[PDB]
Design a protein around this ligand. Structure first.
Ligand code: HEM
Ligand code: HEM
Ligand SMILES: CO/C=C(/C(=O)OC)c1ccccc1Oc1cc(Oc2ccccc2C#N)ncn1
Lengths: 52, 160, 75, 48, 105, 378, 61, 52
């Protein structure tokens, strides 16, 4: 708990932050595409084709 | 090494299962100790027990004519090689007079050796070895030395 | 997984054991046994029983209060 | 509702009479094997 | 030194007796859970202490199995419960904490 | 050479059941591990002989079960053996978990965590198994529990209707619950194998929580014969139920066919779900219900992170011993409340026991362990 | 009785695992007859007259 | 095949013959008892009780 609190760890977090952000994008777009989540997919231009 | 007649000796050399073993028949008035002693690595105690116990049992149930003649021959040789010179013979005179009452002549020992066929070995072995409680003495790095119950279990064969 | 001969370092400990065929299975079954069970009941009744006795009271009261709640003497 | 009634009471008696013979017997088997440990004696002999 | 500090000491002697490892001949440090700092402290013990430790654990496991306890006189007295692992375990944690302070900068 | 060691198959059997170094001092509380294996096998062997005669359709779902008990040669013996075996399995699961908690066995992180997965899987099995007879309790238990999944935000209603195969517990629900009830015990056995794989890594813990390396005995014959005697005791308890009291632990409504239009006076689980059923009705919120219900079992996964004591076992821990027995009594309180209606004294003391369960695991027992350390100057 | 009943039972039938298995198998057959019928006979006494085997002679042809 | 043909093996067979005979008896009486094989069981005195 207290052992992971220091300058190196703040650097280590800063180093892996763009990566952990991009995996979130992979997870989200991945979930959105796999379920056909209409709420989000109504916004994207070519995927829009599902006229009720 | 691997070419030794005795199965225990041959397996022990091949698989480096000990530094030594020896059989014994320690005699006292109306009683005695009959079995084996061995010295081995800490990891080799289990195999050594198994291979020895299995040998007692092989002999108890399924001893064969040829190997019994070898045992007879080793004994004839052991008895004659032992009685070599004044100190061994004088010792044999003193001891035999206390334990047998007479000196048993070599011809009689031969006569009693010659009598022992395979049927004799497995009957006599069974009388003493088969399904009996051993006395077990262990010293040194003996974590791998079998539990008494397991040693007791090796004193009989489920196949027989 | 570990096997015998690789477990731990132990030094200078002698264990004397007897064959099961030389000894009786129930040595002093009731003479030594009965005192022993009473001893380890006594050693634990203060840790095991007071939550159950507490449940028993919360059970006995609760059941009583459930029955005498629907009925009423005045209108 | 329960045609098996008579049969289950019958085998139930056989269950109890068997267990009454088997329970002490398996106990005695376990107690026999375990007597090697139950009567075992320890001695500690550290150097000088 | 104090009347109430003698009472904390008597409540501690009470708990010690209630814990009852002394009934199995054990010392307090025998009963510790074996973590990495602990494993190292056992490893760092001298021959005589390790051998005694081994025997005391051996004895208590034997008693545990046969569901017995030691005669009253042979119980480990609270006053003479030698905390043999203390300085070893304190040194191992000291060393760990340094490594962890170093792994921070 | 000894073929027990060399031969690839026999090697496993030797390392698992024969030559395995086991602690000299393990209680009768260590017996339930083998007893659970007996119970899983017993359930597979009785379950299959039932499946040879059972029909998976709402029409003769109830009639096939009747056909088993009435017409099928000794079918009644197999049927009550299976129904009581499921309860036997649950008495054992509980002793086993309790033993793990008392003796600090949870510090075996993976073994224990695989056991949490093992508990959930046996629970999921029994729940689905109960629907199969298609009695009043079978249907009404199913509708009252599945409908909880509606309370999940956004995902909710879609999930229930996906598990349902329609808009209620219907034709399709009975059929799929049989399929899932048939496959799950095998997936259990495979997880139980991985459970044992992780256990053999450390070997067994013991009543003292101190290492037993200095006093290890071979599994055979000591724990071979002790597990035989233990199984003879489990067969006694199982056959006492099957052959003297086959309807004792069961609900009478299951003896009338399912009726979706008529709800029974009482809606109660078999004893093994009563504690958790109580927790659910105790909290008035829909979602809070299911979230406390999942947390009712999922909490066991937190227990290792809430270990605070310098010692492993509770053997030398009196403060923790009292708070342990408080948990067992509190669960027995929740068991009692589960099988009771939702009126005056029961609503209050029900939710009182519910808040206590979570306080006892999350706050109370981790505090006692800290105090016990201070008392030993540790 | 000169050597014990147990001593003569070990000598003749318990030494060999072969005759030990044979004594169990032969002993299992003879036990099943004495038990099944013996326990059925005990079941007769606690249900005297109640059973169809007692009634039987009432409805004959 | 030809390796197992010799004086020792004839001795080894003779040594295990009473044992292999007695296991046959165990197997037979075992099978007879387990199936309730009436053909053989009609001959034994106390087990005879199964009057058609
Ligand atoms: C599918 C039912 C289960 C089976 C078949 C099973 C199997 C067993 C077996 C054979 C053992 C070794 C003997 C013993 O110590 O009892 C054991 C120990 C263990 N099991 Fe399970 N178990 C199951 C349920 C559980 C559950 C539900 C948990 C935890 C929520 C659990 C966690 C453990 C732990 C921690 C041990 C180690 C106990 C110790 O040796 O100190 N198991 N299991
Ligand atoms: C994880 C082990 C198992 C558990 C805990 C379990 C649990 C249950 C339960 C609680 C019941 C309802 C009891 C009743 O009302 O009679 C049931 C019935 C049923 N089970 Fe299982 N069972 C298991 C193994 C299996 C297996 C492996 C099969 C498939 C071979 C199976 C097939 C059945 C069938 C067909 C029924 C309906 C017949 C009946 O109710 O008696 N079970 N089971
Ligand atoms: C189909 O109903 C099966 C039941 C059953 O098998 O009870 C033992 C049952 C019968 C009546 C009422 C409800 C029933 O189902 C259940 C199911 C249940 O599931 C869990 C068990 C333990 C922990 C959490 C949950 C959940 N969710 N908790 C309580 N009752």
């Amino acid at each position: 708990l207290t052992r992971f609190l220091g300058p190196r760890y703040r650097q280590l977090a800063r180093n892996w932050v763009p990566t952990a952000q991009l995996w979130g994008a992979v997870g989200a777009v991945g979930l959105v595409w796999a379920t056909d989540s209409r709420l989000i997919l109504d916004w994207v231009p070519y995927i829009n084709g599902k006229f009720k | 090494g691997a070419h030794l007649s005795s199965p225990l000796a041959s397996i022990a050399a091949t698989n480096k299962l000990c530094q030594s073993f020896q059989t014994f028949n320690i005699c006292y008035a109306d009683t005695g100790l009959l079995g084996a002693h061995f010295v081995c690595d800490h990891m080799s105690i289990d195999d050594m027990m198994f291979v020895l116990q299995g040998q007692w049992m092989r002999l108890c149930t399924s001893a064969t004519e040829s190997e019994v003649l070898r045992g007879k021959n080793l004994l004839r040789n052991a008895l004659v090689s032992h009685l070599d010179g004044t100190t061994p013979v004088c010792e044999d005179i003193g001891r035999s007079l206390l334990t047998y009452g007479r000196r048993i002549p070599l011809a009689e020992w031969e006569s009693r050796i010659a009598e022992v066929d395979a049927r004799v070995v497995r009957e006599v072995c069974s009388k003493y070895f088969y399904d009996q409680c051993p006395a077990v003495a262990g010293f040194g790095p003996i974590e791998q030395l079998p539990d008494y119950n397991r040693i007791r279990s090796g004193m009989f064969w489920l196949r027989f | 997984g570990r096997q015998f001969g690789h477990l731990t370092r132990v030094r200078h400990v002698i264990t004397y054991s007897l064959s099961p065929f030389e000894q009786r299975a129930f040595p002093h079954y009731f003479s030594k046994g009965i005192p022993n069970v009473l001893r380890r009941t006594r050693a634990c009744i203060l840790r095991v029983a007071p939550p159950f006795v507490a449940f028993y009271l919360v059970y006995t009261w609760g059941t009583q209060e459930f029955e005498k709640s629907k009925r009423k003497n005045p209108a | 509702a329960e045609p098996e009634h008579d049969h289950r009471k019958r085998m139930g008696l056989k269950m109890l009479l068997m267990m009454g013979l088997l329970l002490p017997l398996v106990y005695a088997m376990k107690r026999h094997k375990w007597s090697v440990l139950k009567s075992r004696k320890l001695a500690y002999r550290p150097p000088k | 030194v104090s009347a109430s500090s003698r009472w904390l000491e008597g409540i501690r002697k009470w708990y010690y007796n209630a814990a009852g490892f002394n009934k199995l001949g054990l010392m307090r440090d025998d009963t510790i859970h074996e973590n990495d700092d602990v494993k190292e402290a056992i490893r760092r013990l001298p021959e005589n202490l390790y051998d005694d430790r081994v025997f005391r654990i051996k004895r208590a496991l034997d008693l545990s199995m046969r569901q017995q306890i030691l005669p009253k006189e042979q119980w480990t007295k609270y006053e003479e419960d030698k905390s043999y692992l203390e300085p070893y375990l304190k040194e191992v944690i000291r060393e760990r904490k340094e490594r962890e302070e170093w792994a921070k900068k | 050479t000894n073929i027990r060691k060399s031969h690839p198959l026999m090697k496993i059997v030797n390392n698992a059941f024969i030559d395995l170094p086991a602690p000299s001092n393990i209680s009768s509380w260590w017996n339930f591990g083998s007893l659970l294996g007996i119970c899983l096998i017993l359930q597979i062997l009785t379950g299959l002989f039932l499946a040879m005669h059972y029909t998976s359709d709402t029409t003769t779902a109830f009639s096939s079960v009747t056909h088993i008990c009435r017409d099928v040669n000794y079918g009644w013996i197999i049927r009550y053996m299976h129904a009581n075996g499921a309860s036997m399995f649950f008495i054992c699961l509980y002793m086993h978990v309790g033993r793990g908690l008392y003796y600090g066995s949870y510090t075996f992180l993976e073994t224990w965590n695989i056991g949490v997965i093992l508990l959930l899987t046996v629970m999921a099995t029994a729940f689905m198994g109960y629907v199969l007879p298609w009695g009043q309790m079978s249907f009404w238990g199913a509708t009252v529990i599945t409908n909880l999944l509606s309370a999940i935000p956004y995902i909710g209603t879609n999930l229930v209707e996906w598990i349902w195969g329609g808009f209620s517990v219907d034709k399709a629900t009975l059929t799929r619950f049989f399929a899932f009830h048939f496959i799950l015990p095998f997936i259990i056995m495979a997880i139980a194998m991985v459970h044992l794989l992780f256990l053999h890594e450390t070997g067994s813990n013991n009543p003292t929580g101190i290492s037993s390396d200095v006093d290890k005995i071979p599994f055979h014959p000591y724990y071979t014969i002790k597990d035989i005697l233990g199984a003879l005791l489990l067969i006694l308890a199982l056959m006492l139920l099957v052959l003297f009291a086959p309807d004792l632990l069961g609900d009478p409504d299951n003896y009338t066919p399912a009726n979706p239009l008529n709800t029974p006076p009482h809606i109660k689980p078999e004893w093994y779900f009563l504690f958790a059923y109580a927790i659910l009705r105790s909290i008035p919120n829909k979602l809070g219900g299911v979230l406390a219900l999942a947390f009712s079992i999922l909490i066991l996964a937190l227990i290792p992170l809430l270990h605070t004591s310098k010692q492993r076992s509770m053997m030398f821990r009196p403060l923790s011993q009292c708070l342990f027995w408080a948990l067992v009594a509190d669960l027995l309180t929740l068991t009692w409340i589960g099988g009771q209606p939702v009126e005056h004294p029961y609503i209050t003391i029900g939710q009182l026991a519910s808040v206590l369960y979570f306080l006892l695991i999350l706050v109370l027992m981790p505090t006692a362990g800290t105090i016990e350390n201070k008392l030993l100057k540790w | 009785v000169a050597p014990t009943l147990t001593a003569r039972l070990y000598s003749l039938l318990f030494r060999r695992t072969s005759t030990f298995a044979l004594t169990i198998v032969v002993g299992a057959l003879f036990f099943e007859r004495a038990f099944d019928q013996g326990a059925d006979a005990i079941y007769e006494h606690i249900n005297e007259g109640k059973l169809w085997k007692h009634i039987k002679h009432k409805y004959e042809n």
